[PDB]
Amino acid sequence: ITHQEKLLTVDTTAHPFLKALGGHEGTDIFPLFMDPYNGLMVMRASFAPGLTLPLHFHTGTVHMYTISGCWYYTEYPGQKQTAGCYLYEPGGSIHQFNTPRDNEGQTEVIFMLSGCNVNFTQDGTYLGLSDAGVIKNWVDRAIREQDNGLRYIAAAVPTYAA
């Protein structure tokens, strides 16, 4: 009959977002939940206007809710995502995130990404991988480098039972 006196909770307004994920200006993150072992991350992202990210091939599902702003996938320009929009993206899909230059402000999203992200250029050249582990390393480094006093939830690696 386990204890748990406190809830595993993170207030995203009590600390500034980690700036420039992987050194990419315009992509600010606030980590919430990171499980590198089951390949799962739940994050809040804050996107600057005028961004065009690389093509992201998804190995698992993506659940995304746009709180505010605007963004669209290069391939589907007539289906812009704005306040209150939800998107389910299955594994095996590949699209390219864009924030229009004409956005007056930040585009705010919360998403749940399963699996890994394999990054390509529009012409198919492999750029790199981004799994929960990789992102966590930048996060932990960003927390130190930017002197941010934020906390997030993380799943430990499985081991032999005690």
Automatic annotation (TrEMBL):
Top-level taxon in the UniProt lineage: Bacteria
Annotated Gene3D superfamilies: Jelly Rolls
Residue intervals of the ChrR-like cupin domain: 8-112
Pfam (any one): Cupin_7
InterPro entries, per the entry: ChrR-like_cupin_dom, RmlC-like_jellyroll, RmlC_Cupin_sf
Protein name: ChrR-like cupin domain-containing protein
Organism: Cupriavidus pinatubonensis (strain JMP 134 / LMG 1197) (Cupriavidus necator (strain JMP 134))
